[PDB]
Amino acid sequence: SRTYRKVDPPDVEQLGRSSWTLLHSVAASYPAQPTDQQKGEMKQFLNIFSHIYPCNWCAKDFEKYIRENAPQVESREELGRWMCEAHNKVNKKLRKPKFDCNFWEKRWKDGWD
Amino acid sequence: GSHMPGSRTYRKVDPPDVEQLGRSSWTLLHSVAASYPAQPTDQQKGEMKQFLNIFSHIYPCNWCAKDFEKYIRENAPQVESREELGRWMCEAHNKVNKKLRKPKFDCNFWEKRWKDGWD
Numbered sequence: 074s075r076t077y078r079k080v081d082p083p084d085v086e087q088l089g090r091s092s093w094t095l096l097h098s099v100a101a102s103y104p105a106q107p108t109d110q111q112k113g114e115m116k117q118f119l120n121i122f123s124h125i126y127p128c129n130w131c132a133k134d135f136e137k138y139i140r141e142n143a144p145q146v147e148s149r150e151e152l153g154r155w156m157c158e159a160h161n162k163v164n165k166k167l168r169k170p171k172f173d174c175n176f177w178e179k180r181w182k183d184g185w186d
Numbered sequence: 187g188s189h190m191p192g193s194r195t196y197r198k199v200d201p202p203d204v205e206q207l208g209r210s211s212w213t214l215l216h217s218v219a220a221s222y223p224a225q226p227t228d229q230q231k232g233e234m235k236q237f238l239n240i241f242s243h244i245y246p247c248n249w250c251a252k253d254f255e256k257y258i259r260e261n262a263p264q265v266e267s268r269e270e271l272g273r274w275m276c277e278a279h280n281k282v283n284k285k286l287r288k289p290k291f292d293c294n295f296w297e298k299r300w301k302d303g304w305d
């Protein structure tokens with residue numbers, strides 16, 4: 074109330090945009106040549122994320138997606154592409170335009186100049 | 187800042203800075219705490235600890251992550267219930283608030299901010 078303005082909990086939409094920001098940013102700072110431990114932790118991270126993501130149907134669907142499309146974690150390029158395709162699967166459901174994954178790296182890593 | 191090549195809705199938005207990444211990631215972390223069970227299973231407890239451990243390794247801000255890793259080491263995540271995990275998350279966020287000279291959030295209002303609203 075006092076120190077901070079009263080703000081309502083995020084809706085599914087706000088949770089989503091916040092969460093893609095984290096997901097794509099995690100991929101953008103993943104190594105080009107990850108260690109075995111980094112590969113395993115990334116797979117584990119995404120598996121648990123799919124269990125705990127705080128939208129029921131979002132999480133359930135994402136778990137099924139991972140089961141059917143194993144995360145590609147051999148390099149940042151692969152993981153970034155995997156994340157882009159995963160995000161595009163959701164865009165397709167929600168009747169959002171397909172994002173061109175050739176721009177994933179500019180959008181989430183390098184910027185536009 | 188106009189539309190990216192070949193698109194009609196996606197603008198050339200810059201990668202998030204430390205601030206934008208930060209408020210997005212707090213949104214996810216507190217929201218994770220808010221939908222954690224009152225009575226979690228052993229698997230849920232174990233995965234929550236693993237998730238936060240891995241998060242502390244991979245959080246894309248280097249110094250943010252190293253500090254968070256150290257914070258976890260010194261203040262073990264309290265995962266026996268939603269109430270405990272919310273409070274732990276509020277205290278963790280408050281330690282970063284402290285570092286950054288932002289006000290202390292009164293953790294008694296964590297559930298209203300991240301779960302119940304203010305009606």
Ligand SMILES: Cc1cc2nc3c(=O)[nH]c(=O)nc-3n(C[C@H](O)[C@H](O)[C@H](O)COP(=O)(O)OP(=O)(O)OC[C@H]3O[C@@H](n4cnc5c(N)ncnc54)[C@H](O)[C@@H]3O)c2cc1C
Pocket residue numbers: 085086087088089090091092093097126130131132134135156157158159160161163164166167169172177180196197199
């Ligand atoms: C794992 C997950 C599952 C979800 N499932 C659902 C669901 O089932 N139903 C539902 O209603 N909501 C779901 N959400 C939320 C949904 O995807 C959106 O995040 C939310 O609706 C907000 O949409 P938005 O239009 O603001 O842009 P968002 O889709 O959140 O995207 C934000 C920005 O990401 C960039 N971007 C867009 N597409 C890509 C891409 N393919 N690759 C890289 N960058 C891209 C663009 O710059 C865009 O502006 C889910 C979210 C997550 C993280």
Ligand SMILES: Cc1cc2nc3c(=O)[nH]c(=O)nc-3n(C[C@H](O)[C@H](O)[C@H](O)COP(=O)(O)OP(=O)(O)OC[C@H]3O[C@@H](n4cnc5c(N)ncnc54)[C@H](O)[C@@H]3O)c2cc1C
Pocket residue numbers: 077078080204205206207208209210211212216245249250251253254275276277278279280282283285286290291296299
């Ligand atoms: C794990 C982690 C570590 C970070 N470490 C650093 C760092 O070392 N240095 C750095 O510059 N940035 C760091 N960041 C980012 C920083 O915490 C902020 O997110 C960023 O500066 C933007 O601040 P903000 O004013 O927009 O509000 P945020 O601090 O991002 O908070 C967003 C909202 O959360 C609510 N809130 C505030 N405090 C609490 C609380 N204690 N409990 C529950 N809800 C609360 C308020 O309503 C607030 O408006 C870190 C982020 C994370 C997620």
